[PDB]
Write a protein that binds this ligand. Structure first.
Ligand SMILES: C[C@H]1CC[C@@H]2C(C(=O)O)=C[C@H]3CC(C)(C)C[C@]213
Ligand SMILES: O=C(O)CCC(=O)C(=O)O
Ligand SMILES: [Fe+3]
Ligand SMILES: [Mg+2]
Ligand SMILES: [Mg+2]
Length: 275
């Protein structure tokens, strides 16, 4: 793996505004352990599971960690957005309290959330990983304001093998980087764009650590990050997660902030190619 390090546990920095902001400024992310209500997170995992039983031919008697699906692509993603009640989760007072502590002011949560339910493909000779993400910055496609932050949460635990999101430590300090067409990552049967290896720095150490439901990983608009594929074997786990963006309540609310995933993903996926 190109991963060379773990996320730093930033939870004890929450009590110190100056130290929290200092870490975030240098590194471009915060990793917070067990700050969300784990029981609330479980209910969202359960919602996703029931969607997968209805739409992905998942075992109706499997536990969350026993669950699998034959194919991410066979699942109607639009219909999954009716099952997973993410807005109710993000806007729960317990969740909002955490967001407000991070920003130090009232927040607005994007009306778009991406939901991810990725089965293990350990052993597959022709794995389907084209639905993952290349190295990119969320600020490449979200704007015009660049003061939102991405909030990424596991719905069930991740392992180093089941994957998640890898962060290039401190890669958010030189603005937007070039994103170029990459045939190996696709949405709606067309390539998307990612940051090429020539815009990657060896100094921006790649980080990924296992996370538990209740944890949050959040990062700057210019943080360069990529998906880690699910090659889990023991245990063989689904990688179940969701990501939204959050910004100060006073900041401009752009297209991405105001438009649900079902009404924007297709158009945005085409739109980025003209950027
Ligand atoms: C920039 C690329 C990779 C990351 C984003 C992404 C994702 O799944 O996070 C899929 C592509 C389509 C998009 C318009 C939402 C922008 C994406
Ligand atoms: O979880 C992934 O595979 C990618 C996540 C991502 O790009 C994001 O949260 O902005
Ligand atoms: Fe992203
Ligand atoms: Mg059985
Ligand atoms: Mg800058």
């Amino acid at each position: 793996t190109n991963v060379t390090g773990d996320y730093t546990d930033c939870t004890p920095l929450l009590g110190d505004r100056a130290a929290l902001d200092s870490f975030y400024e240098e590194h471009g992310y915060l990793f917070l352990r067990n700050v969300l209500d784990r029981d609330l997170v479980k209910t969202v995992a359960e919602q996703m599971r029931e969607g997968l039983v209805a739409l992905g031919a998942a075992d109706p008697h499997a536990t969350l960690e026993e669950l699998t699906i034959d194919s991410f692509e066979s699942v109607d993603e639009v219909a999954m957005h009716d099952y997973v009640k993410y807005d109710a989760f993000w806007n729960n007072p317990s969740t909002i309290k955490v967001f407000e502590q991070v920003f130090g002011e009232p927040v607005f949560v994007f009306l778009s959330t991406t939901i991810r339910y990725y089965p293990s493909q350990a052993g597959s000779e022709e794995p389907s990983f084209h639905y993952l993400t290349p190295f990119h910055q969320d600020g490449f496609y979200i704007g015009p304001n660049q003061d939102f932050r991405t909030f990424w949460i596991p719905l069930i635990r991740t392992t180093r093998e089941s994957g998640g999101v890898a962060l290039a430590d401190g890669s958010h300090r030189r603005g937007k980087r070039d994103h170029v067409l990459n045939e190996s990552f696709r949405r709606f049967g067309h390539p998307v764009r990612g940051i090429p290896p020539t815009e990657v720095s060896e100094d921006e150490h790649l980080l990924h650590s296992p996370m538990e439901p209740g944890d949050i990983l959040l990062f700057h608009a210019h943080m360069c990050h990529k998906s880690i594929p699910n090659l889990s074997k023991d245990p063989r786990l689904m990688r179940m997660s969701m990501d939204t963006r959050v910004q100060p309540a006073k900041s401009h609310r752009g297209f991405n902030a105001m438009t649900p995933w079902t009404e924007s993903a297709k158009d945005a996926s085409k739109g980025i190619m003209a950027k």
